[PDB]
Amino acid sequence: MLIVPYNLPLPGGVVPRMLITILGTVKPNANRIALDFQRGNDVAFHFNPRFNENNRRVIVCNTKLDNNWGREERQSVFPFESGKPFKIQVLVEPDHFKVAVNDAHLLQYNHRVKKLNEISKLGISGDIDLTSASYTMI
Numbered sequence: 294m295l296i297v298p299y300n301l302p303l304p305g306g307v308v309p310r311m312l313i314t315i316l317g318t319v320k321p322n323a324n325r326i327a328l329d330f331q332r333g334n335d336v337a338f339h340f341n342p343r344f345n346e347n348n349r350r351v352i353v354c355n356t357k358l359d360n361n362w363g364r365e366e367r368q369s370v371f372p373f374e375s376g377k378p379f380k381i382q383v384l385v386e387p388d389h390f391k392v393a394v395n396d397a398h399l400l401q402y403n404h405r406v407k408k409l410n411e412i413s414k415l416g417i418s419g420d421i422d423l424t425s426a427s428y429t430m431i
């Protein structure tokens with residue numbers, strides 16, 4: 294397994310048609326997963342499955358600018374399950390990140406950070422066994 298937290302450099306940032314694929318397995322009794330697409334200290338796109346927020350499962354997405362979190366975007370469709378293997382695909386499109394889990398579209402997140410070519414790292418963290426993390430241009 295890859296060591297979590299894991300840093301995947303994104304050379305020259307992201308760009309439309311870049312597809313990022315994360316494969317792993319959720320731990321038993323997991324609490325959280327997080328993908329952090331970072332522009333230096335800023336987080337352009339935070340994708341944060343929460344397994345037990347007041348006994349509900351929710352995916353929180355947000356952006357962190359100058360150490361301040363913005364307005365969350367929340368999705369109640371929750372495809373992850375403790376103990377089970379998953380695939381996350383993040384396709385960069387002109388206006389948003391488009392996320393599919395296990396080959397099913399999940400959500401889109403509009404670009405708040407405009408300098409896509411400066412979003413040059415992806416941090417992967419949380420309660421997973423991480424199998425692989427990679428990108429390709431489609």
Ligand SMILES: O=C1N[C@H](C(=O)O)CC2=C1S[C@H]1[C@@H](O2)O[C@H](CO)[C@H](O)[C@@H]1O[C@@H]1O[C@H](CO)[C@H](O)[C@H](O)[C@H]1O
Binds near residue numbers: 339341353363365
């Ligand atoms: O510790 C905290 N200090 C804040 C204070 O002291 O003002 C208040 C606050 C928490 S926790 C939790 C919860 O209240 O509700 C908030 C929205 O109302 C957030 O959901 C927040 O969680 C944070 O959300 C971020 C994404 O927005 C990241 O995921 C981050 O990792 C995570 O810590």
Ligand SMILES: [Cl-]
Binds near residue numbers: 405406407408
């Ligand atoms: Cl920007």
